[PDB]
Amino acid sequence: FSENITGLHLGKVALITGGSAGIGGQVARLLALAGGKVMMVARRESELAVARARIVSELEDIGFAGVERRVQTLANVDVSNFESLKGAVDATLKAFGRIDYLINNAGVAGAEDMVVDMGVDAWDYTLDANLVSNYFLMHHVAPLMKAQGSGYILNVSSYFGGEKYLAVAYPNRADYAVSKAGQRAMVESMARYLGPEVQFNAIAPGPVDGDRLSGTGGKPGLFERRGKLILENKRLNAVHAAAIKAIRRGVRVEAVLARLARNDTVKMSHDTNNPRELRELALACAREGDGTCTWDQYLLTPQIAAALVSRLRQAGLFLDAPEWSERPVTEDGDWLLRVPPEDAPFLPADKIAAEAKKVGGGVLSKLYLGKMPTEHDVAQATVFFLADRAVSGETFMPSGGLSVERSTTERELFGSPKQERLDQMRGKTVWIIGEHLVDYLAETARAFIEDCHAANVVLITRTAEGFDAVEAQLDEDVAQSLTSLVVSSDIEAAMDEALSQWGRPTTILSTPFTALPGKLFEAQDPLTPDEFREVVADNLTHHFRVSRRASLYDDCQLVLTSPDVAMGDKSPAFALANFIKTTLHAFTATLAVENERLVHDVPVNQINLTRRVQSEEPRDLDEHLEEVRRFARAVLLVGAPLPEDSRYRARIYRGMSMTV
Amino acid sequence: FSENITGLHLGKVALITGGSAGIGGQVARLLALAGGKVMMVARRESELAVARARIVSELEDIGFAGVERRVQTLANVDVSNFESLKGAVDATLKAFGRIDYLINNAGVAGAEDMVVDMGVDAWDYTLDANLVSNYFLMHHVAPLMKAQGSGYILNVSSYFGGEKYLAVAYPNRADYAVSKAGQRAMVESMARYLGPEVQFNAIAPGPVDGDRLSGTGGKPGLFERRGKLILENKRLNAVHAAAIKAIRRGVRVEAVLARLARNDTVKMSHDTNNPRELRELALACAREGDGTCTWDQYLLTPQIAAALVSRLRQAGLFLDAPEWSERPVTEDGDWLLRVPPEDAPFLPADKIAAEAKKVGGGVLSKLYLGKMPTEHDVAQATVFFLADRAVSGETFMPSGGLSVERSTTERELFGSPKQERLDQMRGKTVWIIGEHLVDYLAETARAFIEDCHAANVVLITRTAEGFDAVEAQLDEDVAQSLTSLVVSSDIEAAMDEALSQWGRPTTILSTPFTALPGKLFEAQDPLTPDEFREVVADNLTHHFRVSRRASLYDDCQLVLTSPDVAMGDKSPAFALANFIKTTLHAFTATLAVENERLVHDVPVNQINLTRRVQSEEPRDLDEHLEEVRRFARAVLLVGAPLPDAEDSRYRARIYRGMSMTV
Numbered sequence A: 001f002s003e004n005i006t007g008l009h010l011g012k013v014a015l016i017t018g019g020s021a022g023i024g025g026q027v028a029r030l031l032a033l034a035g036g037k038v039m040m041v042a043r044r045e046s047e048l049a050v051a052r053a054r055i056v057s058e059l060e061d062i063g064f065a066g067v068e069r070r071v072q073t074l075a076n077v078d079v080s081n082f083e084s085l086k087g088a089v090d091a092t093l094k095a096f097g098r099i100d101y102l103i104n105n106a107g108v109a110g111a112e113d114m115v116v117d118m119g120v121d122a123w124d125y126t127l128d129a130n131l132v133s134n135y136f137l138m139h140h141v142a143p144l145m146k147a148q149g150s151g152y153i154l155n156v157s158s159y160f161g162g163e164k165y166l167a168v169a170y171p172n173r174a175d176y177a178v179s180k181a182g183q184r185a186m187v188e189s190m191a192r193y194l195g196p197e198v199q200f201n202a203i204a205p206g207p208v209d210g211d212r213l214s215g216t217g218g219k220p221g222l223f224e225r226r227g228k229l230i231l232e233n234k235r236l237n238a239v240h241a242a243a244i245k246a247i248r249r250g251v252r253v254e255a256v257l258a259r260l261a262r263n264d265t266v267k268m269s270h271d272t273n274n275p276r277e278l279r280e281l282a283l284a285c286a287r288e289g290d291g292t293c294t295w296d297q298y299l300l301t302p303q304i305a306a307a308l309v310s311r312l313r314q315a316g317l318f319l320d321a322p323e324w325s326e327r328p329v330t331e332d333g334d335w336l337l338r339v340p341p342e343d344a345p346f347l348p349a350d351k352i353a354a355e356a357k358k359v360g361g362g363v364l365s366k367l368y369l370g371k372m373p374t375e376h377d378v379a380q381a382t383v384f385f386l387a388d389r390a391v392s393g394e395t396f397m398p399s400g401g402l403s404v405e406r407s408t409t410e411r412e413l414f415g416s417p418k419q420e421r422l423d424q425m426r427g428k429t430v431w432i433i434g435e436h437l438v439d440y441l442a443e444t445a446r447a448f449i450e451d452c453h454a455a456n457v458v459l460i461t462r463t464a465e466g467f468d469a470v471e472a473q474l475d476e477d478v479a480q481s482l483t484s485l486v487v488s489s490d491i492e493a494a495m496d497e498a499l500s501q502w503g504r505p506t507t508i509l510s511t512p513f514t515a516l517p518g519k520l521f522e523a524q525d526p527l528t529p530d531e532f533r534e535v536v537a538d539n540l541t542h543h544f545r546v547s548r549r550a551s552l553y554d555d556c557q558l559v560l561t562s563p564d565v566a567m568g569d570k571s572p573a574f575a576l577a578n579f580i581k582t583t584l585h586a587f588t589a590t591l592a593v594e595n596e597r598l599v600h601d602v603p604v605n606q607i608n609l610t611r612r613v614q615s616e617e618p619r620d621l622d623e624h625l626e627e628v629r630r631f632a633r634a635v636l637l638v639g640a641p642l643p644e645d646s647r648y649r650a651r652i653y654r655g656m657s658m659t660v
Numbered sequence B: 001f002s003e004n005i006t007g008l009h010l011g012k013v014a015l016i017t018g019g020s021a022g023i024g025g026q027v028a029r030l031l032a033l034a035g036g037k038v039m040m041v042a043r044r045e046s047e048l049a050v051a052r053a054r055i056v057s058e059l060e061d062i063g064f065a066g067v068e069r070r071v072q073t074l075a076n077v078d079v080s081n082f083e084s085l086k087g088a089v090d091a092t093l094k095a096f097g098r099i100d101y102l103i104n105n106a107g108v109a110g111a112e113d114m115v116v117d118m119g120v121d122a123w124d125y126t127l128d129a130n131l132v133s134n135y136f137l138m139h140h141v142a143p144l145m146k147a148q149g150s151g152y153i154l155n156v157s158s159y160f161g162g163e164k165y166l167a168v169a170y171p172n173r174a175d176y177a178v179s180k181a182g183q184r185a186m187v188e189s190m191a192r193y194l195g196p197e198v199q200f201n202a203i204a205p206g207p208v209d210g211d212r213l214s215g216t217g218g219k220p221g222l223f224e225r226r227g228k229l230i231l232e233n234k235r236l237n238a239v240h241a242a243a244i245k246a247i248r249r250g251v252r253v254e255a256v257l258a259r260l261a262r263n264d265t266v267k268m269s270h271d272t273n274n275p276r277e278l279r280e281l282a283l284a285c286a287r288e289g290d291g292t293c294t295w296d297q298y299l300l301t302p303q304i305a306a307a308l309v310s311r312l313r314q315a316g317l318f319l320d321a322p323e324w325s326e327r328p329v330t331e332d333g334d335w336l337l338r339v340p341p342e343d344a345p346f347l348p349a350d351k352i353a354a355e356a357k358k359v360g361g362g363v364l365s366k367l368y369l370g371k372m373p374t375e376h377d378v379a380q381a382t383v384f385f386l387a388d389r390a391v392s393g394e395t396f397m398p399s400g401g402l403s404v405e406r407s408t409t410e411r412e413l414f415g416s417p418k419q420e421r422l423d424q425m426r427g428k429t430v431w432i433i434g435e436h437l438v439d440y441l442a443e444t445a446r447a448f449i450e451d452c453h454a455a456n457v458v459l460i461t462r463t464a465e466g467f468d469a470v471e472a473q474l475d476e477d478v479a480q481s482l483t484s485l486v487v488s489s490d491i492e493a494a495m496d497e498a499l500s501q502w503g504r505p506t507t508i509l510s511t512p513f514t515a516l517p518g519k520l521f522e523a524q525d526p527l528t529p530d531e532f533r534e535v536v537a538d539n540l541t542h543h544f545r546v547s548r549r550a551s552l553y554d555d556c557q558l559v560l561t562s563p564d565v566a567m568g569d570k571s572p573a574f575a576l577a578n579f580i581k582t583t584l585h586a587f588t589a590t591l592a593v594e595n596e597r598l599v600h601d602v603p604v605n606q607i608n609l610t611r612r613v614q615s616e617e618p619r620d621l622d623e624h625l626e627e628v629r630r631f632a633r634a635v636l637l638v639g640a641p642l643p644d645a646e647d648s649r650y651r652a653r654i655y656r657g658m659s660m661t662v
């Protein structure tokens, strides 16, 4: 095979990010063997030098001449650092005089945290490294490809980013799932604008047999890594649920934490003073041990204890607690009276190996081809696909025939709920977050106040003027139930403030503060990488920031809104709205599953203000008014307290994406 | 060095149907140049020998040895003749000792007729040649591939068969679109059973630049062919629409036909004898001429006149017409008083070119890559795809980035029709076609009679016993509104009889008479090609045969039901149900668009009794009874008189061509 493809890519120049190991390293090798010139870029010089030396050796044995000039490297290229990516494009043009193929391969694992535990800096790092970097490179390279008459951009996505019309939940990995869904959504929505010169496709492999999944240099594999994270999250969620259940029946949060602080399962289990939830928790913990590990003797590590206290604080459960209201956030890891010893593992290696084979068996049983493809197999497929000239706007699936069955698919709404369900909103508080969508925000505020009899709608805006524009659309009697909160720092602080001032909401509607831009690849005025980064911030990160608070509120429903497009617009705004709809659905689907494992059990659903087909968009004022009214009906459908009456019914109100 | 890609397919053996020209011929060529051994099969020996000679000559140049033995042919292999296909497999094994790749490439264009004009034999020819032929070959080669531990089956589909979760309408081509959708649906639903040894994928190119599309030797190009058939259908549809509007106003059908038989635009335009609909028709026809063609002077050719009378007869409009009911069907082309002259064209060359440019422009404007791919470009993509070892169950799209925007996704049902809309069923007649689905047919009969106040539910069955079982589930007071009609010849005859006895229905629910088989590729008891052909007859052709009559009924709504699976079943029935859902959706989407062009304007929607996710299927009695009730609500949603485009453009579109899963 590897000596007999010299004709496939002869003279083609490829820039490969993360080109030193894994799939990227195999693609670099096979492109070279197929006669291509490669610029391999990555952070570490040592892996890059060894990988390049091995490829150049093989090129010699095949009988290439001038081997040293066919394969080049640039180290210290971090896909989260845009300046270093511009350096990679400049080095490729200096070595080779052109770029034919851009392979967006580099990907980080990301935060590996439930959304309620994930940091904004960790989320931003994952989205910058995995998604915004790809747009950065396309921005710089696509014009060179269009000027020479040809090029190919390939995004390396994942099966866990979903497929066209079918989102997938990836619990504990929402930042990663969104970033991978984003890579594919870019291909689906932007390939139109890269044509006719540039092909733009994605690959979506699932788990891949090589050193990183296997485990290399003392380090455990990805199935084992996921298994360990599942057990950590199970213990956090179980201690968290006990504390919340105790607080819900009126145990003081200081009394729960004072008793958790003693961090002794034996004592807590047999102590009469401890609330029943904590007694039961400690009994259950005490039965889970193996004889070496410590988790049967201690409830918490400092790390899990820090995550527990942050969840309680974020839910507003410290607002009336003397000590805890003022304690510095920097001491969240320091409140346990005793801690597991450094000498022994917290988690039992048998329960880790069992969770790891449940994860593995789960994927392995869904492969049509019976075995996980190797890195070589995925690289081979990639190099074959790069030779085709008739495909654009598609995601190839070199996954082993991986088929995870799910019913999480964008639906067009035409249906309603019972006035009895709506009458449960009477006297309740709801939050609407928004700015530019005045007609939609006003009709929703009207529906909640006038049709559902909510006592208070807190309209959280970027500016006072945004409030005034919505208030001016309501009758004076309806506006009497509209409260203004203008963001002064960040949305989480505005949500913390709304909660402390006016109480716990029953419904939170999240809408973007800013309209989409009307540009993408136009030579005159293109969307710059910074502007695209801001689109991601305003339409994806914004929802994550609202979601990470909302998911901690008892008896609350969360509704996420994807972007509108102005009537009669013919710009790439429509393509950007469909990019957001797809990418946000990965978030909605994943968060809906994570929230069902949390004691707060918050339903999450998505409403879309842009249709799939641009000619079906509203085209006159009657159709606009129909859509505004349908939007408010969809918010009430997924935002009013949910009616299990049925296994089918229960699935249909978590993680849905509904278009109006 | 520059031409060496032998690493991709050295020593792999391919059988390619339609291997002598077009995409198939270029696939055979590029597989051979990539080191593959090929058995090219087709009808004509002469074309096969030229194709084989050119490949063998091109091999010898780029320096292969043992070259004549690497490329073999078998003539007289026709995908509509299953014995000849078995021969092709035996010849591949004789020549090369194994088969690695099966390329299901041969296909026919099919009937090129609207559903309401298409013959059952034309439909059956298309499905046998394009779809059942692929299963026939899969049935014979899959066990060979499983026994050697590896293989690849590639179905050559079309972009106009749609894509996963997104059907596409292909008006005038419903037989072809179903066959192409079927090729893809086999990949999506059966790859699990061909694994782990066998990769099973499709390709779905759009229009492909080569001899076939351009046309040669005075034979029209595909765009020009589609253009002329659009003009012929537009004239048939316009004459038919004028006739129907005249009959609706109360002009006797014998009167309308006596005037049409004069076949003279100028006299019809001016004569006051003539109903307003025919005068306006004649005036429009009279202004469409180019000075050469005759369609401005005659309304009809014998062919269009035969198609018109067939539409009127099948709508029951001859039931009270003495001369016409008794006319033999043989004479449907013989009733014009004058026919266009044989030497001059009926249709104007200029409007054909303008319809062909309109079809061409619509396609080209939707290509991301700006240019239609060549045959060579599609074949090259195919040969690169066949070297991959990690893809199964996918459709590749070497189309030039062809993107036709539509909103035909399959959806789960959570909907609400207003009681006001359901109340328009009061006093109306409904037809339910079925046999095996007793609980669903009974709850649907009960919903129409008790919740919607229909006067009459005609339950059209295969047997009296099937009627007796539905009737036994109903209260005596509901059962009073249930009428039995047992099929005695075919479903079309049973519909004509139901119409003649009990009048025009408001809703027709089509359900398959037979349950799906519980097998597919099992070595012990596989689904044979004949059994698979009966699945196609019972679950696709069945709905075609109902739809062809229903689509001619004023103020009727048509509902097509895809298969159920028995609770607890773990067989390939579930995969067959999903194969049918996808394939039937191509029919549903295409028929909804054709019917809007017809004067009758019959809505068509699909309801699916099987979910996409097997763990989501009903697991106990309670979940079964819930699904049964939800099915009957779904039939009411799409079966009651629908929303007008005038009321809402959005809502009008939702209720036409949908596929809804309960």
Ligand SMILES: NC(=O)c1ccc[n+]([C@@H]2O[C@H](COP(=O)([O-])OP(=O)(O)OC[C@H]3O[C@@H](n4cnc5c(N)ncnc54)[C@H](OP(=O)(O)O)[C@@H]3O)[C@@H](O)[C@H]2O)c1
Binding pocket: A017, A018, A019, A020, A021, A022, A023, A024, A041, A042, A043, A044, A045, A047, A077, A078, A079, A080, A104, A105, A106, A107, A108, A129, A156, A157, A158, A159, A204, A205, A206, A207, A208, A209, A212, A213, A222, A375
């Ligand atoms: N492996 C799987 O199971 C799997 C499954 C589905 C999808 N994928 C996708 O496949 C792609 C390749 O993953 P892999 O598992 O083959 O990777 P891997 O073996 O970890 O190799 C990653 C390569 O990327 C480089 N890299 C890592 N972080 C980087 C950063 N911040 N900036 C620049 N380069 C970086 C590495 O070198 P340095 O560390 O020196 O930078 C190395 O060259 C990713 O896009 C991933 O999401 C992988």
Ligand SMILES: NC(=O)c1ccc[n+]([C@@H]2O[C@H](COP(=O)([O-])OP(=O)(O)OC[C@H]3O[C@@H](n4cnc5c(N)ncnc54)[C@H](OP(=O)(O)O)[C@@H]3O)[C@@H](O)[C@H]2O)c1
Binding pocket: B017, B018, B019, B020, B021, B022, B023, B024, B025, B041, B042, B043, B044, B045, B047, B077, B078, B079, B080, B104, B105, B106, B107, B108, B129, B156, B157, B158, B159, B205, B206, B207, B208, B209, B212, B213
């Ligand atoms: N070309 C397009 O525009 C286009 C677009 C989308 C999809 N497709 C699909 O692409 C495939 C290839 O079509 P093409 O356009 O390349 O076809 P084509 O140019 O007509 O090629 C015909 C080849 O098939 C053979 N053939 C024809 N009828 C046959 C029959 N009944 N049984 C066996 N062999 C037969 C022909 O030889 P004999 O006549 O000697 O039998 C010849 O070898 C078909 O599946 C079609 O649905 C084509």
